[PDB]
Ligand SMILES: c1cc(-c2csnn2)ccn1
Ligand SMILES: [Ca+2]
Ligand SMILES: [Ca+2]
């Protein structure tokens with residue numbers, strides 16, 4: 079037999095993702111780079127592997143959309159809601175949606191796509207919000223320039239997947 083696990087998490091270390099569409103605000107290459115790096119944040123501290131698919135069904139489907147976009151979490155136009163992702167689970171589990179009425183950047187302007195994606199993918203992997211204001215998973219976006227995953231987030235993700243190679 080098998081009972082349900084303690085926490086929502088992926089039962090496999092190999093995860094796929096697909097960028098289903100692209101924001102007008104950035105080039106395809108900038109978007110792809112920001113998401114690659116956002117995934118690397120998590121894979122660097124776990125045994126998780128992330129492979130990109132160009133078509134088909136992925137564990138983590140990534141899309142930009144506005145207003146009603148095919149779920150119970152419709153966006154609100156410019157300002158307010160920003161992005162959201164679903165915990166691991168069947169179908170839409172793992173998926174990450176970005177509001178294309180916000181402005182997305184690879185700078186300190188607007189919302190940095192890398193930082194928000196890194197936060198969203200934490201949700202895609204099984205992390206909820208942290209109370210640590212310095213943590214990546216703190217609910218409120220702040221821009222940081224340098225990237226070092228804060229220890230609250232390292233401990234959180236490793237509680238789910240282990241550390242993988244510690245050096
Ligand atoms: C997107 C990004 C964030 C975030 C980045 S750093 N700390 N929180 C929170 C909510 N939505
Ligand atoms: Ca999915
Ligand atoms: Ca919005």
Ligand SMILES: [Zn+2]
Nearest residue numbers: 147149151175
């Ligand atoms: Zn959505």
Ligand SMILES: [Zn+2]
Nearest residue numbers: 197201207217
């Ligand atoms: Zn969040």
